[PDB]
Coordinates of C-alpha atoms in Angstrom, one line a residue:
Chain A
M1 CA 0.2 0.4 -0.2
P2 CA 1.3 3.5 -0.3
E3 CA 2.7 5.6 2.8
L4 CA -0.4 8.4 3.9
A5 CA -0.2 10.3 7.1
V6 CA -2.0 12.7 9.2
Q7 CA -0.8 16.1 6.9
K8 CA 0.5 15.3 3.6
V9 CA 2.4 16.7 0.8
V10 CA 1.8 16.4 -2.8
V11 CA 3.7 18.0 -4.8
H12 CA 3.3 19.0 -8.4
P13 CA 6.1 17.5 -11.2
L14 CA 5.5 21.1 -12.8
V15 CA 6.7 22.7 -9.4
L16 CA 9.8 20.6 -9.1
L17 CA 10.8 21.3 -13.1
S18 CA 10.4 25.1 -12.1
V19 CA 13.4 24.9 -9.6
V20 CA 15.5 22.9 -12.1
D21 CA 15.0 25.7 -14.4
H22 CA 15.8 28.8 -11.6
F23 CA 19.1 27.4 -10.4
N24 CA 20.3 27.9 -14.7
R25 CA 18.8 30.9 -15.4
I26 CA 19.4 32.9 -12.5
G27 CA 22.6 32.5 -13.4
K28 CA 24.0 33.4 -9.8
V29 CA 25.0 29.7 -9.4
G30 CA 28.7 29.2 -9.6
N31 CA 28.7 31.1 -6.6
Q32 CA 27.1 28.2 -4.8
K33 CA 24.2 29.9 -2.6
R34 CA 20.7 28.9 -1.8
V35 CA 18.3 28.5 -4.1
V36 CA 15.3 29.6 -2.1
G37 CA 11.7 30.3 -2.9
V38 CA 8.1 30.6 -1.7
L39 CA 5.8 27.5 -2.6
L40 CA 2.1 28.1 -3.3
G41 CA -0.6 26.2 -3.6
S42 CA -4.2 24.4 -2.6
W43 CA -4.8 23.0 0.7
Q44 CA -7.9 21.6 2.3
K45 CA -8.8 20.0 5.3
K46 CA -5.4 18.3 6.0
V47 CA -4.0 17.5 2.6
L48 CA -1.1 20.7 1.1
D49 CA -1.4 19.8 -2.7
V50 CA 1.5 22.2 -3.7
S51 CA 0.1 23.6 -7.0
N52 CA 2.4 26.4 -7.3
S53 CA 5.6 28.4 -6.6
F54 CA 7.6 31.3 -7.4
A55 CA 11.1 32.1 -7.3
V56 CA 12.6 34.9 -4.4
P57 CA 16.2 36.4 -4.9
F58 CA 18.3 36.4 -2.0
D59 CA 21.3 37.9 -1.8
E60 CA 23.4 36.3 1.7
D61 CA 26.8 37.0 2.5
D62 CA 29.5 34.5 1.7
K63 CA 31.3 35.2 4.8
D64 CA 28.9 35.5 7.6
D65 CA 25.5 33.6 8.7
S66 CA 24.1 36.3 10.4
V67 CA 24.4 39.1 7.5
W68 CA 21.6 38.2 4.6
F69 CA 19.4 40.1 2.6
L70 CA 15.6 39.5 1.6
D71 CA 12.5 41.8 0.8
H72 CA 9.2 41.3 2.3
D73 CA 7.7 43.6 0.1
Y74 CA 8.3 41.7 -3.1
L75 CA 6.5 39.1 -1.5
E76 CA 3.4 41.0 -1.4
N77 CA 2.9 42.5 -4.4
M78 CA 3.3 39.5 -6.3
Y79 CA 1.0 37.6 -4.0
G80 CA -1.5 40.3 -5.1
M81 CA -1.3 39.9 -8.8
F82 CA -1.4 35.6 -8.3
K83 CA -5.1 36.4 -5.8
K84 CA -5.9 38.4 -9.1
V85 CA -5.3 35.2 -11.4
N86 CA -6.3 32.6 -9.7
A87 CA -7.7 32.8 -5.9
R88 CA -7.0 29.1 -5.3
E89 CA -3.3 29.7 -4.8
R90 CA -2.7 29.7 -0.7
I91 CA 0.7 30.4 0.5
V92 CA 2.0 26.6 1.5
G93 CA 5.5 27.0 2.4
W94 CA 9.1 27.3 0.9
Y95 CA 11.6 26.0 -0.9
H96 CA 15.3 25.5 0.0
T97 CA 18.4 23.6 -2.3
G98 CA 19.7 21.6 1.1
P99 CA 21.8 18.9 0.9
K100 CA 22.7 20.2 4.3
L101 CA 20.5 22.8 6.9
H102 CA 21.9 26.1 7.7
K103 CA 21.3 28.2 10.8
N104 CA 19.4 30.6 8.7
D105 CA 16.9 27.9 7.7
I106 CA 15.3 29.2 10.6
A107 CA 15.6 32.5 9.8
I108 CA 13.5 32.1 6.5
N109 CA 11.0 29.9 8.5
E110 CA 10.0 32.8 11.2
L111 CA 8.7 34.9 8.1
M112 CA 6.4 32.3 6.8
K113 CA 4.9 31.1 10.0
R114 CA 3.5 34.4 10.3
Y115 CA 1.5 33.9 7.4
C116 CA 0.3 30.7 8.2
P117 CA 1.2 28.5 11.2
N118 CA 2.2 26.0 8.7
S119 CA 4.6 26.0 6.6
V120 CA 6.6 23.0 4.8
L121 CA 10.3 23.2 4.2
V122 CA 11.2 20.9 1.0
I123 CA 13.9 20.1 0.4
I124 CA 14.8 19.5 -3.3
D125 CA 17.8 18.1 -4.7
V126 CA 17.9 17.5 -9.0
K127 CA 21.8 16.4 -8.3
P128 CA 21.1 12.7 -7.5
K129 CA 21.3 12.0 -3.4
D130 CA 18.8 9.1 -3.8
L131 CA 18.0 6.9 -6.5
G132 CA 14.2 6.7 -5.2
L133 CA 12.6 10.4 -4.8
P134 CA 15.2 13.0 -4.2
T135 CA 12.8 15.4 -2.9
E136 CA 11.9 15.1 0.9
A137 CA 9.5 17.9 2.8
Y138 CA 9.7 18.5 6.3
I139 CA 7.3 20.9 8.4
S140 CA 9.1 23.0 11.0
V141 CA 8.3 25.3 14.1
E142 CA 10.9 26.2 16.9
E143 CA 11.0 24.7 20.3
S152 CA 14.7 23.4 18.7
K153 CA 14.3 23.0 15.2
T154 CA 11.7 20.3 14.3
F155 CA 11.3 18.3 11.4
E156 CA 8.7 15.9 10.1
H157 CA 9.0 12.7 7.7
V158 CA 5.5 13.5 6.2
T159 CA 4.7 11.6 3.3
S160 CA 6.2 13.2 0.0
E161 CA 4.2 11.8 -3.2
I162 CA 3.4 13.2 -7.1
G163 CA -0.2 13.6 -7.6
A164 CA -1.4 15.5 -10.5
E165 CA -3.7 17.4 -12.4
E166 CA -5.1 15.9 -15.9
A167 CA -3.1 18.8 -18.0
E168 CA 0.4 18.0 -15.9
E169 CA 0.4 14.1 -16.5
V170 CA -0.1 14.3 -20.0
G171 CA 3.1 16.8 -20.2
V172 CA 4.9 14.7 -18.4
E173 CA 4.4 11.9 -20.5
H174 CA 5.2 13.9 -23.6
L175 CA 8.7 14.3 -22.8
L176 CA 9.2 10.8 -22.3
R190 CA 11.0 -7.0 -6.5
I191 CA 14.4 -6.1 -7.8
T192 CA 14.0 -2.1 -7.3
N193 CA 12.8 -3.1 -3.9
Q194 CA 16.3 -4.9 -3.2
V195 CA 18.3 -2.3 -4.3
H196 CA 17.1 0.7 -2.1
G197 CA 16.9 -2.3 0.7
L198 CA 20.5 -2.4 0.8
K199 CA 21.4 1.4 0.2
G200 CA 19.5 2.4 3.3
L201 CA 21.7 -0.2 5.4
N202 CA 24.5 1.4 4.0
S203 CA 23.8 4.9 5.0
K204 CA 22.9 3.6 8.9
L205 CA 26.2 1.8 8.4
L206 CA 28.1 4.8 7.5
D207 CA 26.5 7.1 10.9
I208 CA 27.5 3.8 13.0
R209 CA 30.9 4.4 12.2
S210 CA 30.9 7.9 12.0
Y211 CA 29.6 7.9 15.2
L212 CA 32.3 5.6 17.0
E213 CA 34.8 8.2 15.3
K214 CA 33.3 11.2 17.0
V215 CA 32.9 9.4 20.6
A216 CA 36.8 8.3 19.9
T217 CA 37.4 11.9 19.4
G218 CA 34.9 13.9 21.8
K219 CA 32.7 15.5 19.2
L220 CA 28.8 16.4 20.2
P221 CA 27.4 13.1 19.8
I222 CA 25.8 12.1 23.4
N223 CA 22.2 11.5 22.5
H224 CA 20.3 8.8 24.1
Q225 CA 17.9 8.1 21.2
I226 CA 20.2 6.7 18.9
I227 CA 21.9 3.6 21.0
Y228 CA 17.9 3.0 22.5
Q229 CA 16.7 2.5 18.9
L230 CA 19.2 0.2 18.1
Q231 CA 19.1 -2.1 20.3
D232 CA 15.3 -3.3 20.0
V233 CA 16.0 -3.7 16.2
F234 CA 18.6 -6.1 16.8
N235 CA 16.0 -8.5 19.2
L236 CA 13.7 -8.7 16.4
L237 CA 16.0 -9.3 14.1
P238 CA 15.3 -9.9 10.0
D239 CA 13.9 -13.0 8.4
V240 CA 14.4 -12.4 4.6
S241 CA 17.9 -13.9 6.0
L242 CA 18.8 -15.2 9.4
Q243 CA 17.3 -18.1 10.9
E244 CA 18.2 -17.3 14.6
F245 CA 14.8 -16.1 16.5
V246 CA 12.6 -16.9 13.3
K247 CA 13.2 -20.9 13.5
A248 CA 10.1 -21.3 16.0
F249 CA 7.8 -18.8 13.8
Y250 CA 9.0 -21.0 10.5
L251 CA 7.6 -24.0 11.1
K252 CA 4.0 -22.7 10.8
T253 CA 5.1 -20.8 7.5
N254 CA 6.4 -23.5 5.4
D255 CA 2.8 -25.0 5.7
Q256 CA 1.0 -22.2 4.4
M257 CA 3.2 -21.3 1.4
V258 CA 3.3 -25.3 0.4
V259 CA -0.7 -24.5 0.1
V260 CA -0.5 -21.6 -2.1
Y261 CA 1.7 -23.5 -4.4
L262 CA -0.2 -26.2 -4.1
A263 CA -3.5 -23.7 -6.1
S264 CA -0.6 -22.7 -8.3
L265 CA -0.2 -26.4 -10.0
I266 CA -3.7 -26.6 -10.7
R267 CA -4.0 -23.0 -12.4
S268 CA -1.2 -24.1 -14.9
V269 CA -3.1 -27.0 -16.2
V270 CA -6.0 -24.8 -16.7
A271 CA -4.2 -22.4 -18.7
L272 CA -2.3 -24.9 -20.8
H273 CA -5.8 -26.6 -21.3
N274 CA -7.2 -23.2 -23.2
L275 CA -3.7 -23.1 -25.3
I276 CA -4.8 -26.9 -26.7
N277 CA -8.3 -25.1 -27.7
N278 CA -6.3 -22.5 -29.6
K279 CA -3.9 -24.7 -31.5
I280 CA -6.3 -27.3 -32.6
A281 CA -8.3 -24.4 -34.5
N282 CA -5.1 -23.3 -36.3
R283 CA -4.5 -26.6 -37.5
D284 CA -7.8 -26.9 -38.5
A285 CA -8.0 -23.8 -40.6
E286 CA -4.3 -24.7 -41.9
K287 CA -4.8 -28.1 -43.0
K288 CA -8.0 -27.4 -45.0
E289 CA -6.4 -24.2 -46.9
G290 CA -3.8 -25.8 -48.0
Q291 CA -1.3 -24.9 -45.4
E292 CA -0.3 -21.3 -45.4
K293 CA 1.0 -19.7 -41.7
Chain B
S156 CA 16.2 -38.0 -58.4
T157 CA 13.7 -38.8 -61.3
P158 CA 15.8 -41.6 -62.6
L159 CA 17.8 -42.9 -59.6
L160 CA 14.4 -44.1 -57.8
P161 CA 13.0 -46.6 -60.7
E162 CA 16.6 -48.3 -60.5
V163 CA 16.3 -49.1 -56.6
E164 CA 13.1 -49.8 -56.7
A165 CA 13.5 -52.9 -59.2
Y166 CA 16.2 -54.1 -56.8
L167 CA 13.9 -53.8 -53.7
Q168 CA 11.0 -55.7 -55.6
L169 CA 13.8 -58.3 -57.4
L170 CA 14.3 -58.8 -53.2
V171 CA 10.4 -59.1 -52.1
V172 CA 9.9 -61.7 -54.9
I173 CA 12.8 -64.2 -54.1
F174 CA 11.7 -65.1 -50.8
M175 CA 9.6 -68.2 -51.1
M176 CA 9.6 -68.2 -54.6
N177 CA 13.1 -68.6 -55.6
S178 CA 14.0 -70.4 -51.9
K179 CA 12.2 -72.4 -49.5
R180 CA 14.6 -71.6 -46.8
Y181 CA 15.7 -68.6 -45.6
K182 CA 19.6 -68.9 -46.4
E183 CA 19.2 -69.8 -50.2
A184 CA 17.7 -66.6 -51.2
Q185 CA 20.7 -65.4 -49.3
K186 CA 23.2 -66.1 -52.3
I187 CA 21.1 -63.5 -54.5
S188 CA 21.0 -61.0 -52.1
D189 CA 24.5 -60.7 -51.7
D190 CA 26.0 -60.3 -55.3
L191 CA 22.8 -57.5 -55.2
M192 CA 24.3 -55.9 -52.5
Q193 CA 27.5 -54.4 -54.5
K194 CA 25.7 -51.7 -56.0
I195 CA 25.6 -49.8 -52.8
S196 CA 29.2 -50.2 -52.3
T197 CA 29.6 -48.8 -55.7
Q198 CA 28.6 -45.4 -55.5
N199 CA 30.0 -43.5 -52.5
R200 CA 28.7 -40.1 -52.1
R201 CA 27.2 -39.9 -55.5
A202 CA 24.2 -40.3 -53.3
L203 CA 22.4 -40.5 -49.9
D204 CA 19.1 -40.6 -50.8
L205 CA 18.7 -44.1 -50.4
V206 CA 17.8 -47.3 -48.5
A207 CA 20.5 -49.5 -48.2
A208 CA 19.5 -51.7 -44.7
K209 CA 16.8 -54.1 -46.5
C210 CA 19.5 -56.5 -48.0
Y211 CA 21.6 -56.7 -45.0
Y212 CA 18.3 -56.8 -42.9
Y213 CA 17.4 -59.6 -43.9
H214 CA 20.4 -61.6 -43.7
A215 CA 20.4 -60.3 -40.4
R216 CA 16.6 -61.1 -38.4
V217 CA 17.9 -64.7 -38.5
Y218 CA 21.0 -64.5 -36.7
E219 CA 18.9 -63.5 -34.2
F220 CA 17.5 -66.6 -33.2
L221 CA 20.3 -68.6 -32.6
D222 CA 21.5 -69.0 -35.4
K223 CA 24.9 -68.5 -36.6
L224 CA 25.5 -65.4 -39.5
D225 CA 27.6 -63.5 -37.1
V226 CA 29.8 -62.4 -40.0
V227 CA 27.3 -59.3 -40.6
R228 CA 29.1 -57.3 -38.0
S229 CA 32.1 -56.7 -39.7
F230 CA 29.8 -55.7 -42.9
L231 CA 28.0 -52.9 -40.5
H232 CA 31.1 -52.0 -38.8
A233 CA 32.4 -51.0 -42.3
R234 CA 29.5 -49.0 -43.1
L235 CA 29.7 -46.7 -40.0
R236 CA 32.9 -45.5 -41.8
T237 CA 31.8 -45.0 -45.3
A238 CA 29.4 -42.6 -43.5
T239 CA 31.7 -39.8 -42.8
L240 CA 29.6 -38.4 -39.7
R241 CA 29.5 -35.2 -41.0
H242 CA 27.9 -37.0 -44.4
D243 CA 25.0 -39.2 -44.6
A244 CA 24.3 -39.2 -40.8
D245 CA 20.1 -40.5 -41.2
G246 CA 21.4 -43.4 -42.7
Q247 CA 24.0 -43.9 -40.6
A248 CA 21.8 -43.9 -38.0
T249 CA 19.4 -46.4 -39.1
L250 CA 22.5 -48.8 -39.2
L251 CA 23.5 -47.9 -35.7
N252 CA 20.1 -48.9 -34.5
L253 CA 20.4 -52.8 -36.4
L254 CA 24.1 -53.2 -34.9
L255 CA 23.0 -52.4 -31.6
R256 CA 20.3 -55.1 -31.6
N257 CA 22.5 -57.8 -32.7
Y258 CA 24.6 -56.7 -30.0
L259 CA 21.7 -56.7 -27.4
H260 CA 21.0 -60.3 -28.0
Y261 CA 24.6 -61.8 -27.3
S262 CA 26.6 -60.6 -24.7
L263 CA 28.8 -58.0 -23.8
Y264 CA 26.4 -54.8 -23.3
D265 CA 29.3 -53.0 -22.7
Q266 CA 30.1 -52.4 -26.5
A267 CA 26.8 -50.4 -26.8
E268 CA 28.0 -48.1 -23.7
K269 CA 30.3 -46.9 -27.0
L270 CA 27.5 -47.0 -29.0
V271 CA 25.8 -44.4 -27.2
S272 CA 28.8 -42.2 -27.1
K273 CA 28.7 -42.2 -30.6
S274 CA 25.1 -41.8 -30.6
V275 CA 25.1 -38.3 -29.8
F276 CA 28.3 -36.7 -32.0
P277 CA 27.0 -34.6 -34.8
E278 CA 23.8 -35.8 -36.9
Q279 CA 21.5 -34.2 -39.1
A280 CA 19.3 -36.8 -38.2
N281 CA 17.5 -37.7 -34.4
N282 CA 17.6 -41.0 -32.7
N283 CA 13.5 -40.7 -31.4
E284 CA 12.5 -41.4 -35.3
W285 CA 12.3 -45.5 -35.1
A286 CA 11.2 -46.1 -31.4
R287 CA 13.0 -49.3 -31.8
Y288 CA 16.0 -47.3 -30.8
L289 CA 14.8 -46.7 -27.4
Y290 CA 13.6 -50.3 -27.0
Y291 CA 17.3 -51.7 -27.3
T292 CA 18.3 -48.8 -25.3
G293 CA 16.1 -49.3 -22.5
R294 CA 17.5 -53.1 -22.3
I295 CA 20.7 -51.6 -21.5
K296 CA 20.1 -49.1 -18.4
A297 CA 17.8 -52.3 -17.0
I298 CA 20.8 -54.4 -16.7
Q299 CA 22.6 -51.8 -15.0
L300 CA 19.4 -51.0 -12.7
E301 CA 18.0 -47.8 -13.4
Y302 CA 14.6 -49.0 -13.2
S303 CA 13.6 -45.0 -13.7
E304 CA 15.3 -44.6 -17.0
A305 CA 14.1 -47.4 -18.9
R306 CA 10.7 -46.7 -17.6
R307 CA 10.7 -43.1 -19.8
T308 CA 12.7 -44.3 -22.8
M309 CA 10.3 -47.3 -22.7
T310 CA 7.2 -45.0 -22.3
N311 CA 8.2 -42.7 -25.1
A312 CA 9.0 -45.5 -27.4
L313 CA 5.2 -46.3 -27.0
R314 CA 3.9 -42.5 -28.1
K315 CA 3.7 -42.3 -31.7
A316 CA 4.5 -45.7 -33.0
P317 CA 1.6 -47.8 -32.3
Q318 CA -1.5 -48.0 -34.5
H319 CA -0.4 -50.7 -36.8
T320 CA 2.7 -52.9 -36.3
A321 CA 1.2 -52.6 -32.9
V322 CA 0.8 -56.0 -32.7
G323 CA 4.5 -57.3 -32.3
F324 CA 6.2 -54.1 -31.4
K325 CA 3.7 -53.6 -28.3
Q326 CA 4.2 -57.0 -27.1
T327 CA 7.8 -57.1 -26.5
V328 CA 8.0 -53.3 -25.1
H329 CA 5.1 -54.1 -23.1
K330 CA 6.7 -57.5 -21.3
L331 CA 9.9 -55.5 -20.7
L332 CA 7.9 -52.6 -19.0
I333 CA 6.4 -55.1 -16.5
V334 CA 9.0 -56.9 -15.5
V335 CA 10.5 -52.9 -14.8
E336 CA 7.8 -52.6 -12.5
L337 CA 8.6 -55.7 -10.3
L338 CA 12.3 -54.7 -10.2
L339 CA 11.6 -51.3 -9.3
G340 CA 9.6 -53.0 -6.7
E341 CA 6.6 -50.7 -7.3
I342 CA 3.7 -52.3 -9.3
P343 CA 0.7 -50.6 -10.4
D344 CA -2.6 -51.4 -10.7
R345 CA -4.3 -54.9 -12.3
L346 CA -7.1 -53.2 -14.2
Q347 CA -4.5 -51.7 -16.5
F348 CA -2.5 -54.6 -17.9
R349 CA -5.5 -56.2 -19.5
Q350 CA -5.6 -54.7 -22.4
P351 CA -2.1 -53.8 -23.1
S352 CA -0.5 -56.7 -25.5
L353 CA -2.8 -60.0 -27.0
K354 CA -4.7 -60.9 -24.1
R355 CA -2.9 -64.7 -24.4
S356 CA 0.1 -63.4 -23.9
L357 CA -1.0 -61.0 -21.2
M358 CA -1.5 -64.3 -18.6
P359 CA 1.9 -65.7 -18.0
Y360 CA 3.0 -61.9 -17.0
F361 CA -0.3 -61.4 -14.9
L362 CA 0.8 -64.4 -13.0
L363 CA 4.1 -63.6 -12.2
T364 CA 3.0 -59.9 -11.3
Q365 CA 0.2 -61.1 -8.7
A366 CA 2.6 -63.2 -7.0
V367 CA 5.0 -60.3 -6.4
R368 CA 2.3 -58.0 -5.4
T369 CA 1.3 -60.8 -2.5
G370 CA 5.0 -61.2 -1.8
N371 CA 5.0 -64.9 -1.0
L372 CA 7.7 -66.8 -2.3
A373 CA 6.4 -70.6 -2.3
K374 CA 4.0 -69.3 -5.7
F375 CA 6.8 -67.1 -7.0
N376 CA 9.0 -70.4 -7.2
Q377 CA 5.9 -72.4 -8.6
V378 CA 4.9 -70.2 -11.7
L379 CA 8.3 -69.6 -12.6
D380 CA 9.5 -73.0 -12.9
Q381 CA 6.8 -73.4 -15.6
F382 CA 7.8 -69.9 -17.4
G383 CA 11.3 -71.0 -17.8
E384 CA 10.8 -70.5 -21.5
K385 CA 9.6 -66.6 -22.0
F386 CA 12.8 -65.7 -20.4
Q387 CA 14.8 -67.9 -22.8
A388 CA 12.7 -67.2 -25.8
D389 CA 13.0 -63.1 -25.2
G390 CA 17.2 -63.3 -24.6
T391 CA 17.2 -61.6 -21.1
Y392 CA 17.8 -64.5 -18.6
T393 CA 19.0 -62.3 -16.0
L394 CA 15.5 -61.4 -14.6
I395 CA 15.1 -65.1 -13.6
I396 CA 17.3 -64.3 -10.8
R397 CA 16.7 -60.7 -9.6
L398 CA 13.1 -61.0 -9.1
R399 CA 13.9 -63.5 -6.2
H400 CA 15.2 -60.8 -4.0
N401 CA 12.4 -58.5 -4.9
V402 CA 9.7 -60.5 -3.6
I403 CA 11.4 -60.4 0.1
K404 CA 11.7 -56.8 -0.3
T405 CA 8.2 -55.8 -1.0
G406 CA 7.5 -58.2 1.8
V407 CA 8.6 -56.5 4.9
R408 CA 7.4 -53.0 3.5
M409 CA 3.8 -54.4 3.0
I410 CA 3.9 -55.4 6.7
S411 CA 3.9 -51.6 8.1
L412 CA 1.5 -51.2 10.9
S413 CA 1.0 -48.6 13.4
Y414 CA 2.3 -48.1 17.3
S415 CA 5.1 -47.2 18.8
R416 CA 6.2 -50.9 20.1
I417 CA 5.2 -53.7 17.2
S418 CA 6.4 -57.3 18.7
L419 CA 8.9 -59.0 17.6
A420 CA 7.2 -62.0 17.7
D421 CA 4.4 -60.5 15.7
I422 CA 6.6 -59.8 12.8
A423 CA 8.2 -62.9 12.7
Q424 CA 5.0 -64.8 12.5
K425 CA 3.8 -63.4 9.4
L426 CA 8.0 -63.6 8.3
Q427 CA 7.7 -67.2 8.9
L428 CA 5.7 -67.9 5.8
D429 CA 7.9 -66.0 3.6
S430 CA 11.8 -67.8 4.8
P431 CA 12.3 -70.4 7.3
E432 CA 13.7 -68.8 9.9
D433 CA 15.9 -66.5 8.4
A434 CA 14.0 -63.6 9.8
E435 CA 15.8 -61.3 11.7
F436 CA 18.7 -60.9 9.9
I437 CA 16.2 -59.8 6.8
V438 CA 14.9 -57.1 9.2
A439 CA 18.1 -56.1 10.3
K440 CA 19.0 -55.1 7.0
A441 CA 16.0 -53.7 5.6
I442 CA 16.0 -51.0 8.7
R443 CA 19.5 -50.1 8.2
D444 CA 18.8 -49.3 4.6
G445 CA 16.1 -46.2 5.2
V446 CA 13.7 -47.4 3.1
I447 CA 11.9 -48.2 6.7
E448 CA 13.5 -47.6 10.0
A449 CA 13.3 -49.1 13.6
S450 CA 14.9 -50.2 17.2
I451 CA 14.9 -54.0 17.5
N452 CA 15.5 -55.5 21.4
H453 CA 15.7 -59.4 21.3
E454 CA 16.3 -59.0 24.8
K455 CA 12.7 -57.4 25.6
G456 CA 11.4 -59.4 21.9
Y457 CA 10.1 -56.1 20.5
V458 CA 10.9 -54.0 17.7
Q459 CA 10.0 -50.2 18.4
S460 CA 9.6 -47.5 15.5
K461 CA 8.8 -43.9 14.8
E462 CA 5.5 -42.4 14.3
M463 CA 4.3 -40.3 11.7
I464 CA 1.6 -38.0 11.2
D465 CA 3.4 -35.3 9.9
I466 CA 3.3 -36.0 5.9
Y467 CA 2.6 -32.8 4.4
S468 CA 4.8 -30.8 6.6
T469 CA 8.1 -30.8 5.0
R470 CA 9.4 -31.0 1.6
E471 CA 8.3 -33.6 0.3
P472 CA 5.4 -31.9 -1.5
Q473 CA 7.9 -29.1 -2.0
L474 CA 9.4 -31.4 -4.6
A475 CA 6.6 -32.8 -5.9
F476 CA 4.8 -29.2 -6.9
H477 CA 8.1 -28.4 -8.5
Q478 CA 8.5 -32.1 -11.0
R479 CA 4.5 -31.7 -11.5
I480 CA 4.9 -27.8 -12.8
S481 CA 7.4 -28.6 -15.1
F482 CA 5.6 -31.1 -17.3
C483 CA 2.8 -28.9 -17.7
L484 CA 5.2 -26.1 -18.4
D485 CA 6.9 -28.0 -21.4
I486 CA 4.0 -28.9 -23.4
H487 CA 2.2 -25.1 -22.4
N488 CA 5.8 -23.8 -24.5
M489 CA 5.2 -26.4 -27.1
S490 CA 1.9 -25.0 -28.1
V491 CA 3.4 -22.0 -29.1
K492 CA 6.1 -23.5 -30.9
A493 CA 3.5 -24.4 -34.1

């Protein structure tokens, strides 16, 4: 089944491409700035549907994280024109490129908060971090800075979907290993850090691992599984029995076809 | 092609005619065949569309009865060389079948091992065109005691061939087929057996099969004495001895009851009929073997065994599903082939 959540974000494919285009066109890139914009869209009962976006200019200092420049007024006037075009376009959130977070992320957030308590922050990188979905969404309010593993899926309107198409187990398994490796890197990292007296001293991180191990996996290993297994083969044995029968049934329908083809050919003179 | 065919056919007609019109015995027409056989010798690679087995074939059948015309081997051996292997394959393959027969009847099946090794070398033919190949092939394997393998080959032989000369050929295959069930020790139902072969002929095999199913030795000996002849006739004698073992082996198997103890005494009473008093020794062999398994105390005069209620709870059906799917699947691919 697909993953769903309390709040949910749907981000349109149109939106994503727009960021790709913004990064190359503004031509400011090659200074390695944050490419930031405001996201617009359609929201209802508890669904963010990101219907629209627009880029915002920004210039930040390249030797100070306290000194950055952004204009509010630009947001009102442009918003005003959008309201005039389509009134089904509310302020949902904003976007930042990532792939790392800033202190300053907190600073763009305070502003969007005012306009609506819920401001989604989407971390979008074209440059492929992940070979599944390379876009991840968080929703943040400060305590400190929170995050949320809110689903991201690509819904669409009728027009949007056709355009996409104009332009144009095994998958599971590659991803599965991937995930293992990401955690693996983190442990090696943790060991290093602890060795060299670096901030990690988080209780949570040890706590999650311990429980996880107790359970064990069952697509490998037998160690914890063996008692469960005894039941398991018996159920599988039955599914297979069913499968057998149906293969004969299929085979039979193929015989009917052949006999008919044979008859037809034979009487004709024979020609395929 | 158009001129070739009448000349050969005249030769061919010549041979039909001489049998009991220019003979009165099956050793006088032969003199006439031998001079005509020259023709085959003469054209080498100027042809490949031929049949050339017949002359040699008529000569040859007679040696199979128990007569002396063993000269013929020399002749077939030369022919396998004349065809290169890479040239004139289909005709070579037919010849190899007739040589293989001659050898099978009389002595050393070992020379067939080799023949088989030849048989799989680059050909432009197939060895399943005349089922007779399978029949010979089966006896070889039978001796060696692969009951299963012989079964496959024989059964494939029965497919796509009888509906004419079903008369003689089904009877020979059918007699061996029955024997193989006895040898394997797994014997099917009595209903089935009736309809194969000629009914009169079916009868000696049936008496034998029934005795083996009862699993009692004395009846097996009495019937066997009457039917010395069949084994002799066939040219496969070794079977007569081999079957003796099988009765006893079925008999222990037959007697499988249920309970954590069966008295040793009980087994011994049933067993008394099979063998005078060689009972425990047989039983021990059987348990050890792993066909059945048990613990015996002669001390407490009981046999203790394992219980089973756990069938269908372990891999034995898993093997079955896999084997069964496969049969259906080959034909499903096959229908598409057309």
